[PDB]
Amino acid sequence: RLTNDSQQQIDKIIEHDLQKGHIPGASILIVKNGKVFLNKGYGYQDVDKKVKASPTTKYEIASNTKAFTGLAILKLAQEGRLNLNDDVSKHVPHFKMNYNGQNETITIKQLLAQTSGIPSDITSEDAVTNKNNRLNDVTRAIMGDELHHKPGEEFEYSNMNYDLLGLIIQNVTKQSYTKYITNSWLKPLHMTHTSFKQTNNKSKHDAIGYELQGSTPVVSKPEFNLWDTPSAYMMTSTEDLEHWIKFQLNPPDKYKSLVQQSHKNLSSTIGEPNANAYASGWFTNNDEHLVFHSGTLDNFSSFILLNPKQNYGIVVLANLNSEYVPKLVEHLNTQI
Template identity: 35%
Template sequence: MKKKTKTTVFISFFIILVLLAMLWKELNILFIPSDYNNVDSMAEVMMKKTSTPGVAMVISRQGKLEYKCYGYADVKHKKKINEESLFEIGSTTKAFTALAIILLEEEGYLYGSDCVTDYISWFTPTYNGKHEKITINQLLAHTSGIPPWSIRLIPEGTKANMLERTIRNISTINLESYPGTKHNYATVNYDILALIIEKITGERFQDFVTDNILLPLGMTESYFSTGHEKISNNLPKGYKAFLGNSVEYRAPRYNGNIAAGYLVTNVKELGFWMNAQLGLGDIPVKLKRAINKSHEVDKESAGYEELNKYYSYGWNHDTKNGVISHSGSNPNYSSQVIMNLEKQEGIFVLANLDSSAPTQIAYNTYKNMMVSR
């Protein structure tokens, strides 16, 4: 019995050491100075320290686009990342979903003050045992009161009804805070928005966004990953970190969560998206007006994060510096976008591993862009 106990203790101690080593590796990145000789060397260091196989980035300076690609789309076959490599962009998808809501509001199909139950009658969450109504604005700002752990209620699967199944799974959830009183990021808020879009338009969410946002911006290679699409040769293998290395990983599919995290695109087309956000390029007037609105912060309805920082319309807003940003994290892909609206500069970084590399690369690059101006 004592021998068994010692073995159990040893195994537990070993597991703790491994986990601490992995955590230290990630934490160490946060304290790396940003005075690199160039962006390339910095990106390579970040990739190495996070075991990230491949990274692609696009930088926009007053509309001029620059692409940088590093590492592998397929490690085993030494296939390189390029500017047309497609990535799941995770939660940076949310800005597209919010923009779809704004387009419908501009056409008079809905209002931000509308309640979810106006469109989904069976959605009846509770707070302190009482049914409470949640508004569209509260979903957009993550002030609905829906807890972050609700992501665990998203069912795995690729059937056509997965979006409604996802929302039904949370339809009677106990709210963590009274709607409108506290910012608490919950990815399913944007899945609810997707179902509202479908109820209003009679179209699939992905079709509405494709026709009204992606195609008008020239994002013809971009699509929402539902699990039914033909896998493109431009889609890099996804990887997962394991004991300090990256291993190929085929992640489960969540068709009910595509509005919150499963747009697939590349840095070439994200350059079009960024320039549209920066007020550059020839885009339809209606879409341009909606984009401008997505940059506005109504402090009464936006999610308050900290001093001068709010969440609204799928963006983290730094109102003091005129910067919008967002990160994205899926099981085997990750992303980070940062844009300075006033200076018309931005950067979008994608990776085929869920790691901190895109965030660190983006912020170090952005910092150097600001210093070198």
């Protein structure tokens, strides 16, 4: 329950936003100047077992997974195993997707860029697949519908982009996506407790996912597709992210270029609140010197803020989907 601060009002800021958002529990990580300044749990990870959220509590990070997927690709691109410009059909078997009359080549970069032209959500209706391709090979599903624009024309935030990058990782690496990230990244990084979601029912160290019915939290077990694991299903803790945050802030020399490329912008956005553009699993504000991404699922909500300049990071993981998570980093940000 790490803290390096003599006395402070940080707790009251955290505790106020959580209580006002009806967030049962969250663990908060603040890393500034290359060492964690505070790692602490607030509220309950499980209301019924009455267990206190802690740095060891694991939450489904959601959309925060995207950063990993994207970095994995960049790493592959660097090793020479794939090329950011080569089309996806070179790594996916018959990935043909069209606009209007005819099919349109989609580059890898365009997937990272979220400019691929793939539609975002709700095509499949109520949380399941008619033919149970629960597993990664979702290519058949994406293929069903036409692109909104030619690849590279306009930005659309879709899980499918990073989902397809997930395959690319699996097909190229010749091992399951999960297996690769763990072996290549999570283990080397020392993120020994980080894993991917299947089952959907939490064990002792996993945090229970809550979803507000009326004004009170109720346990939520949302039906999920495994193909979404690259984009939104990583389950980590603030204790593991600790390594991930320090890596993104001051990467070891061999990784600085790769990491920097990770933050470099690929397309612009006009819908995220504090962001003008998106790069490789991260929203960007270059003018403010900020790199962040918000993750939201039905029963979880999380946020990761990085300022490569000024060497500080803010991580908020909470067990409920609430606006207040983004709000909390803002209040925690102005504090530095």
